[PDB]
Amino acid sequence: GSRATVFKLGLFKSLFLCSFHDITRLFKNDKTTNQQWVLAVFGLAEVFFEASFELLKKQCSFLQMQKRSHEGGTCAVYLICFNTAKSRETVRNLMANMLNVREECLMLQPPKIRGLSAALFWFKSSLSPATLKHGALPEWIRAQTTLN
Amino acid sequence: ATVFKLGLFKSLFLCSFHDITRLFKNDKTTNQQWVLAVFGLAEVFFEASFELLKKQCSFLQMQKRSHEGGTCAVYLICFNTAKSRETVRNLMANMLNVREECLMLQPPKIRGLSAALFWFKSSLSPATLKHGALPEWIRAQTTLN
Ligand SMILES: [Br-]
Ligand SMILES: [Br-]
Ligand SMILES: [Br-]
Ligand SMILES: [Br-]
Ligand SMILES: [Br-]
Ligand SMILES: [Br-]
Ligand SMILES: [Br-]
Ligand SMILES: [Br-]
Ligand SMILES: [Br-]
Ligand SMILES: [Br-]
Ligand SMILES: [Br-]
Ligand SMILES: [Br-]
Ligand SMILES: [Br-]
16 A cells, blocks of 8 residues: 655655656556556665666666665656556556565656656656666657657 | 486585485475575575574574585575475476576485584575574584584
């Protein structure tokens, strides 16, 4: 359980300088499946962030990961494109176990696939040397960030 | 390649895997204490396994070494609950992101001075990862009575 709180949203915004709501859309039912997911994780240890990259690569067509932190806390964000569609219930169980964290430490919703500022969040992230990347960029990001 | 695994282990750790373990021929026999050797393991998984095993063990001692011939990590694990080789094999292959053929598992040789001293010597290295109190069979054979 535990979707999110004013405190988790507040920390995300203080670190990434934009709302978690501006890069995702809403799935109110925990059973609806989807290949693409946006994941935010608070209080994650570095060794598990790095191990998750190698493990997700084997079941994904695309993956982009980054992390930030300051005196108030830490937050890692993932754009995941699974080879097979999964529900929030399933992804929640997979990632809490994989990352060695409580479910309350996560926030999960599918991506906002229409909107230029939303597509530029990922394009900007792909320009950092620290970002971990795997696979070909999703067409919805490529199409909105190209043509002049 | 078992003949070559054994050779790599001795080359790196200075003694034979057979001299620090005893034999369990049946993969279903359960036991709390296990000795594990892993070949070709990545560093990030070695470190992550220390944090995950602490959660279900009363004692743990781990080491990892390498050279142009290859890499090997050795573990003395004391689980809270007794487990069979089948069960430990499945657990660790998945935890470490390696094929089961990359592991060697047997219970420890609990009687013999040279075998107890392998663990005592390992505990003196600053590189060794440790958790919990040393097993009584090691403490008793390596202390002046
Ligand atoms: Br969630
Ligand atoms: Br917000
Ligand atoms: Br919506
Ligand atoms: Br829904
Ligand atoms: Br929708
Ligand atoms: Br989508
Ligand atoms: Br935090
Ligand atoms: Br949308
Ligand atoms: Br549409
Ligand atoms: Br909009
Ligand atoms: Br921008
Ligand atoms: Br797409
Ligand atoms: Br074995």
